[PDB]
Symmetry: C8
């Protein structure tokens, strides 16, 4: 399981070092792809595989289903975690999430989310209460 | 099955001593995270695991689902219960729930909720009848 | 199966002697918690376990679901039935149901309900017909 | 299966003799409780067991469900069928259904219904057609 | 499977001779009960057992369900088919269906229906088309 | 597979004795006896007993406490019959049935996979004459 | 040889036979079932597959007027034909007329079955009929 | 698992060279067919098989289902991937997608999509946000 918030820094080669606590969870490689609200998601391949199936339960004959699948999977990537537990983030992905220097990794149980510290805080700053949001589920 | 109410105190080092009755239930570590109505939830890891699944059953393509999951899992933590049955409560969590000194532990079968004594009493003070509430389920 | 009505007395030490017919059903200990309409329910732990699950099928993201779970499980207790088949009723529970002296135990198949004789009679006094109530189910 | 109509008499000691055809069906004891329209139902414990479960499928958080369950099970009883195939009918039940002298036992497959002859005839005298009632199922 | 239409006679002792084609299907005894539209239904006990179950899927807490069950099972009877394959129809049932002399047995796959010839012809004379009726299923 | 599928149209004749000769292709499918009963739009359906058995069950899924279900069941099963196919593969059609469908001389048997339908030639052509398009009817399913 | 795909232009000879495209011949064993399709086309299936297609119908009322018209219009016209050694199929006359078959056929694979079309009718079908996207959106 | 974006060229003989990463996934042959928004899909035959089944869950008695199936499968093609990992794209398909020189292969987990670079870039240029689209699923 993946939980918690971590504050790390994007190094000069666009890599991120997995927090050791987290590094355990991930084997030799991960699938990265772009998330919602400008964040980049990280997953073990096995989990990436199961996330995807949750999509195939979507029409596909529906225009939006295709836009969604296109925006997600054409940007997913497969990266290897190096011995030091670092992940080189793809160029395009570094841009999609406005990554720069100062990353926040948040555990999402299933996956990891990589954010730009300022964007993440803004996200948190806006966005309603845990109670307000939950009542609507 | 965690049941009952317990009055306890947050010590100087922000630790809480599990009620012995309750300490049995909890093995070496637990997951903590913030709950609803400002309370902090405690769970055996495997129970936290099952709680999460109950979420994945939520859209995810929905904005609210994401806000909910981010609000919850970003603040979950994994704490070790020490030999004496004490748990050091993370600072951020100490603030989320206005924890101070004088905590209330309530069993919730599934998990534990840690409350500020005043807040919890006010919560009970407000909030309708067991019957009024049940009729709406 | 727990069936029937039994008139008993709350002794000096706040204990209740299980009717022997009923004592059988219950092994070494029971869970007690407060019921609806001021009554205190009694169950075999295994049965309390099954009763709880029937709750987990409730939202949880819903405010009312939490109120309900909090009002119920924070007052559940786990009591041991002594050799003479007596159960010491927790103070808080003795107060919730206006227990005093002169109890009524009614079998509810699944559980047992402990009433204040007066309250129970009034409850029966009010409350519509078996047919009137069944027609609405 | 319990079928048919039987005219019998409530003896002086409030006992009823099972019609022999019927006595077969019932082993050593039965559960008795009050029925709808003032009648008293009789069942093999095993069957009473199954009947109850059909209730557990009812809210319980609903006020009516609790009234229904209290009205029914608080009056259920467990009686032993004597060697001569007689069942002593509890006093309270003798009153609920205006039992007196002259009973009617009607098989309901699942259970037996004990009626006051006059009340039953009046029930039949009123009540719509088999077709009219069926069309509404 | 019982099929066909058969013209038979009610003998002076209120007996009917099962059609030989039909008698085979029916072992030593049958359950009889009153049908819909004044007809009397006949079934092998096993089949009656399965027909009943289809009812237990009806509320029971509903007044009409009870009237239906009562009207049906209070008149069900269990009759032995004699060696010559005859069935002595109970008095009450002879009157319910206005049985006189001149019966009509119709196969209903599941059961057999005993009708008064005239009543049946009238039933057929009224009642809409096979298509009209089917369209509404 | 021809022993498992009744397909096709066959023009045949109702002989003097009210018998129909099963087309040989079809006769294979049916064993020694069949169930006959009246169909919809005046046609008479034919089935292998075990198939008739499965058809019926599909009915038990209907209320029964419902008046229309009973009328349906009565109109169908009171007129079902069980007929033995003779050695020459002929089936004697019950009188009542012969009348229900206006059978006379000049029958049409159409394969309906599950069962066979016997029609009066004129009636069948008229049925076909009316009735909408394959497309129009399917759009409504 | 597992799924039928593609478009094929072929000819209906004077004896009313069509030659299965070889690619498609594999897929079909000794015989096929033919029947009339929608939009005037004639469908072809291995019998096992025809069997499976029918079941999908039994999931339809039957007590419903339309269900009967549909079944009558389809199965009364199905036919069981043998694919000769050269891989040809002799199309039943009645079917030849239902689809306005003449000379110049189009076979399109439909995974499950094959559809035999009149070249002109098929082109027109295609000329009309909306976009892949427009149609999909409505599923 | 097909992921990513790849820029490639349609050679003179209308062939495309599978990116090596991708060539692994695909065995000896693929099925091609035309996709939505003018793109051509590619799949291992087994996957093509599974994608089709997802269609059979559509009416068939519905005019649109037939159009959709006709438009798709009448243009599917089965192509062999040569030793050098090249696929000869059917002329008709080359025209459907306005393929020319300069293709973009995007992974779609399930299949591959072949696009004309300009068309693909325009598609992306228009088309709403990842979030906006997801919200509607």
């Amino acid at each position: 399981m993946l939980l918690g918030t971590f504050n790390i820094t994007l190094d000069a080669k666009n890599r991120i070092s997995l927090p050791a606590k987290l590094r355990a969870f991930f084997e030799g490689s991960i699938v990265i792809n772009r998330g919602f609200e400008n964040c980049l998601e990280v997953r073990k391949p096995q989990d990436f595989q199961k996330y995807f199936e949750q999509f195939n339960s979507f029409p596909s004959t529906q225009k939006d289903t295709r836009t969604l699948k296109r925006l997600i999977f054409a940007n997913a990537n497969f990266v290897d975690v190096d011995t030091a537990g670092r992940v080189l983030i793809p160029n395009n992905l570094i841009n999609d999430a406005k990554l720069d220097k100062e990353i926040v990794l948040i555990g999402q149980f299933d996956h990891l989310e990589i954010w730009d510290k300022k964007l993440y805080e803004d996200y948190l700053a806006n966005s309603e209460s845990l109670e307000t949001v939950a009542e609507r589920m």
